Amino acid sequence: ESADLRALAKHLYDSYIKSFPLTKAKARAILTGKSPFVIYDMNSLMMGEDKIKFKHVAIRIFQGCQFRSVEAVQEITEYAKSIPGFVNLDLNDQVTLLKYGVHEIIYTMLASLMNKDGVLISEGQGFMTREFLKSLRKPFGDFMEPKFEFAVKFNALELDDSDLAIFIAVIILSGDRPGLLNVKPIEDIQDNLLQALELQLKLNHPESSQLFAKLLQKMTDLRQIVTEHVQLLQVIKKTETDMSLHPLLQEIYK
Amino acid sequence: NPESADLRALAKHLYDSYIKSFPLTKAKARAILTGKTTDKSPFVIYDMNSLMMGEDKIEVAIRIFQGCQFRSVEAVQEITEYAKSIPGFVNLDLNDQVTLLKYGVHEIIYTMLASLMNKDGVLISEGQGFMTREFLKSLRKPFGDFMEPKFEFAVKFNALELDDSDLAIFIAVIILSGDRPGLLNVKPIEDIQDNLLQALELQLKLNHPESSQLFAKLLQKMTDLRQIVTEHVQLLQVIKKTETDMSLHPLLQEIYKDL
Ligand SMILES: O=C(O)COc1cccc([C@H]2OC(=O)C(O)=C2c2ccc(Br)cc2)c1
Numbered sequence: 001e002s003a004d005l006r007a008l009a010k011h012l013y014d015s016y017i018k019s020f021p022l023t024k025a026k027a028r029a030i031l032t033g034k035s036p037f038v039i040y041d042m043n044s045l046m047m048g049e050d051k052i053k054f055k056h057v058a059i060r061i062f063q064g065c066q067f068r069s070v071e072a073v074q075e076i077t078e079y080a081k082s083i084p085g086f087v088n089l090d091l092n093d094q095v096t097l098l099k100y101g102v103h104e105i106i107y108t109m110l111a112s113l114m115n116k117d118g119v120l121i122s123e124g125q126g127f128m129t130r131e132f133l134k135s136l137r138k139p140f141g142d143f144m145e146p147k148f149e150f151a152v153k154f155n156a157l158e159l160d161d162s163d164l165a166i167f168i169a170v171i172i173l174s175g176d177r178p179g180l181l182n183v184k185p186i187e188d189i190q191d192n193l194l195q196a197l198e199l200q201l202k203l204n205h206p207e208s209s210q211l212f213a214k215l216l217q218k219m220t221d222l223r224q225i226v227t228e229h230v231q232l233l234q235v236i237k238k239t240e241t242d243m244s245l246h247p248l249l250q251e252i253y254k
Numbered sequence: 255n256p257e258s259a260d261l262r263a264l265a266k267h268l269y270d271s272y273i274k275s276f277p278l279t280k281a282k283a284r285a286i287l288t289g290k291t292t293d294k295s296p297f298v299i300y301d302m303n304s305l306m307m308g309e310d311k312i313e314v315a316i317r318i319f320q321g322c323q324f325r326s327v328e329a330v331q332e333i334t335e336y337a338k339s340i341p342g343f344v345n346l347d348l349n350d351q352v353t354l355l356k357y358g359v360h361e362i363i364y365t366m367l368a369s370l371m372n373k374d375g376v377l378i379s380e381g382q383g384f385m386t387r388e389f390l391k392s393l394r395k396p397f398g399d400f401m402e403p404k405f406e407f408a409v410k411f412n413a414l415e416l417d418d419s420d421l422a423i424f425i426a427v428i429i430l431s432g433d434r435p436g437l438l439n440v441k442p443i444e445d446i447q448d449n450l451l452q453a454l455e456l457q458l459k460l461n462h463p464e465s466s467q468l469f470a471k472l473l474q475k476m477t478d479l480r481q482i483v484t485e486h487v488q489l490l491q492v493i494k495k496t497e498t499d500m501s502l503h504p505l506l507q508e509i510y511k512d513l
Contacts, residue, residue, distance in 0.1 A: 153433070209448050210451045210452065213451045213469075216474060219474060220476045220477040220479075224480055
């Protein structure tokens, strides 16, 4: 029966490449060796915007992160709709799985762009450092540090795009999202996704023992930082006197 | 097969210490919850009257919470005894044995508490009593919602149909976690958890053969345990600042100390 598990592994990987432009393999090449722009202080921030083409002082960084998250949701939605059985679910269930899922996949693939010294920005064309992300006014000065502590641990598992492709699918098909209407089949697809993930990590990582069990424990983490960032997204709602400009622009970021 | 036999010896050793460390197991709790015995029948507490009459074995809202933390201290004592029997735990650094226990005990307590709970209430007083879920939820604020997260997780967790032999290994995996803040020597802990995870995977393969992917579905429940600890922690901070005379316990207040 593992013939179908190997089929599903490459089907999800091929769709992973089409839905996501900047893959982990191409981000690892940029982080080590061609070079992009480096934003390390306040001068290189303004210097960046000139020759980088952004699409939007301390709030300009956060608003750009929400612009990138909106583009990410579209890539995650298109990728999820290619998972076998996803589009054949209840349309309300598909909306719910994506609603409570995109935040966890955003940080999983964000780690693919992070090391211990910074993160890539604007499709690998730039690079914001770690210390510059702790030198902003509150509460911006400490909303990326939990995500850097997580990216260090998660990337230590040292997975590739084919492992991540299956791992992304399992997070979307989580059958415990509040408000589901047909919890059965969602757990059915996630059951075969977990089999394909268990098989994938054995054939690609034969030396690392219980990489499948250690990967599932990172989900326990993942949600703890998603629910922590959610409660931080309402500190920006109540603080800063510059987080409400064009009303049509507020509707996009929901 | 010779290496899988080494994992069976580990599984039987953990189950042996489990029986010897926790007096009330899930096997005995299910014999009490389901009314199949004429001798292990509990006195049900459902209102104020059944409370004062069942006082032979056990402010109302405060008195209920005092006994909850009294049993929590009883639980930590049993968890520490069982952790010492896990192979390698006592061989680690003494600072790490305290940190693995500091963040691990509550995730263990809510796991085994689910063995004493059905959808209608919780076993209390060593199985002699049974406090209803409605009465626990009918307590005044902020105590009227102190138990619903525990109950909602139990009916979800008990669906896995795990017995004490599977629970023994899953308890050991939670204690020997490398993801806990303050671990000085992380790698020697990850080696022990790797051995416990191999034993748990084989245990569920043999004890639950028809149940597919029970190993992955069980490891996902650790995400539920974290949110209960965080919601619990948030709730004590409100009680500490409202009931100013409400005093804790050396075992509990030092676990919540900058958790
Ligand atoms: O004392 C009162 O009137 C109300 O407080 C009570 C009432 C009943 C039982 C107890 C405690 O004693 C025990 O043996 C026991 O397990 C207690 C207990 C406390 C909280 C939860 Br949850 C489960 C059990 C305290």
